[PDB]
């Protein structure tokens, strides 16, 4: 996250860190005791399931905490429509090896229904431990960063992405995607934020509106972050989780 601030411990208790071979690669959002939602693109086919971990209840990734818990994965379920980068369906259900116990620092975020609308301009928050500037990693001890971002329609977003575009480097915001951020840049999600929450306030609660997906250069003007809409997958998530792990 570039241009944000450090959250306070426990503020975003659904935020998880996903690591591959012990290195943070992506965020995720806890959605039940044994399920995490992240980005499909965080889980390429060449990676081995056994090398992933999920760290929950963390604030400073580098700091010891008796509140943080680390898990392996039993299942990685990318949405079947995700074919390649920029594809629709950049979303994955992750089943933890075992169920965790909710705590003050580990709590799920509510999923929106399929027809949840989050209107343009809504001030949502994206969080993560990804880069704080182009190719600049968050400094140890890696306190979770947060950034308030207003929602930007895919239509506006597409037109912004066209400004000074390289015709070879296309960027198309699809119907399952939304943007959020600022036309002048300097404030966005960045590399290593992928997979994490865009959390939006609705009726006193917080919903997982978006999953950090892609953009252009960290904090580039005319390039607000692109997110997969969780609402687009609410039916699929409910179906998958209900069949695989009925309550
Ligand atoms: N390197 C600086 C420049 C980065 C720009 C790049 N854009 C791009 O390729 O457009 C292609 C396109 C073509 C056609 C239609 C649309 C899009 C980009 O966003 N790539 C994603 C990962 C790949 C990806 C690309 C398209 C879709 C889905 C996934 C990335 O970096 N996502 C970050 C979060 C970024 C948050 C908003 N800026 C997450 O944290 C993470 N995923 C990563 C995977 C590997 C390594 C680092 C990663 O970081």
Curated annotation (Swiss-Prot):
<dbReference type="GO" id="GO:0070062">
    <property type="term" value="C:extracellular exosome"/>
</dbReference>
<feature type="disulfide bond">
    <location>
        <begin position="124"/>
        <end position="200"/>
    </location>
</feature>
<comment type="similarity">
    <text>Belongs to the peptidase S1 family.</text>
</comment>
<keyword id="KW-0325">Glycoprotein</keyword>
<keyword id="KW-0964">Secreted</keyword>
<dbReference type="GO" id="GO:0005886">
    <property type="term" value="C:plasma membrane"/>
</dbReference>
<keyword id="KW-0720">Serine protease</keyword>
<keyword id="KW-0645">Protease</keyword>
<keyword id="KW-1015">Disulfide bond</keyword>
<dbReference type="GO" id="GO:0005615">
    <property type="term" value="C:extracellular space"/>
</dbReference>
<feature type="disulfide bond">
    <location>
        <begin position="26"/>
        <end position="42"/>
    </location>
</feature>
<feature type="disulfide bond">
    <location>
        <begin position="190"/>
        <end position="218"/>
    </location>
</feature>
<dbReference type="GO" id="GO:0010765">
    <property type="term" value="P:positive regulation of sodium ion transport"/>
</dbReference>
<protein>
    <recommendedName>
        <fullName>Prostasin</fullName>
        <ecNumber>3.4.21.-</ecNumber>
    </recommendedName>
</protein>
<keyword id="KW-1133">Transmembrane helix</keyword>
<keyword id="KW-0472">Membrane</keyword>
<feature type="domain" description="Peptidase S1">
    <location>
        <begin position="1"/>
        <end position="242"/>
    </location>
</feature>
<keyword id="KW-0378">Hydrolase</keyword>
<comment type="function">
    <text>Possesses a trypsin-like cleavage specificity with a preference for poly-basic substrates. Stimulates epithelial sodium channel (ENaC) activity through activating cleavage of the gamma subunits (SCNN1G).</text>
</comment>
<comment type="subunit">
    <text>Heterodimer of two chains, light and heavy, held by a disulfide bond.</text>
</comment>
<keyword id="KW-0812">Transmembrane</keyword>
<feature type="active site" description="Charge relay system">
    <location>
        <position position="194"/>
    </location>
</feature>
<dbReference type="GO" id="GO:0008236">
    <property type="term" value="F:serine-type peptidase activity"/>
</dbReference>
<feature type="active site" description="Charge relay system">
    <location>
        <position position="41"/>
    </location>
</feature>
<feature type="disulfide bond">
    <location>
        <begin position="157"/>
        <end position="179"/>
    </location>
</feature>
<dbReference type="GO" id="GO:0004252">
    <property type="term" value="F:serine-type endopeptidase activity"/>
</dbReference>
<keyword id="KW-0865">Zymogen</keyword>
<dbReference type="GO" id="GO:0006508">
    <property type="term" value="P:proteolysis"/>
</dbReference>
<dbReference type="GO" id="GO:0005576">
    <property type="term" value="C:extracellular region"/>
</dbReference>
<feature type="glycosylation site" description="N-linked (GlcNAc...) asparagine">
    <location>
        <position position="115"/>
    </location>
</feature>
<keyword id="KW-0732">Signal</keyword>
<keyword id="KW-1003">Cell membrane</keyword>
<feature type="active site" description="Charge relay system">
    <location>
        <position position="90"/>
    </location>
</feature>
